[PDB]
């Protein structure tokens, strides 16, 4: 169908946040908690790659609807950072720009860390830098 597909190579390059202040066993509980008790939700954390020249987002477990697409998730941080539906904004999962038409769920499936924590940078550059 020749459809455009935007690759990379993975990579871990990226230091998230919620990472660096939390130890890994910290991290790992609150995530098992967290899917036990919103069962129809995933916990993601959402953080701006370095370079970007955008709006921050809040300090926050963001438990999303399991069945909101990728697509629509979008939509909604582009709300939260104040930036227009004719602004560009792309998501890496280690280092890969997910499909939008992904629900969450199925990207938290695929993509979520030991720790049962989803992990993604944001940018308005579709290469991560």
Known sequence: EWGIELVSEVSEAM????????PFEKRRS???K??????????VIVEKAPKARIG????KKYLVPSDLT???????????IHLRAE??????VNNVIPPTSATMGQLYQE??????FLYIAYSDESVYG
């Open 87 to 92: 602004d560009a904004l792309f998501f890496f």
């Open 70 to 80: 990728v697509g629509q998730f979008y939509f909604l941080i582009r709300k939260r």
């Open 56 to 59: 921050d987002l809040d300090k």
């Open 15 to 22: 230091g998230f946040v919620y990472k660096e202040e939390h």
């Open 30 to 32: 609150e995530g098992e």
């Open 111 to 116: 993509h979520h860390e030991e720790d049962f």
């Open 34 to 43: 967290i899917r036990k008790k919103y069962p129809d939700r995933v916990p």
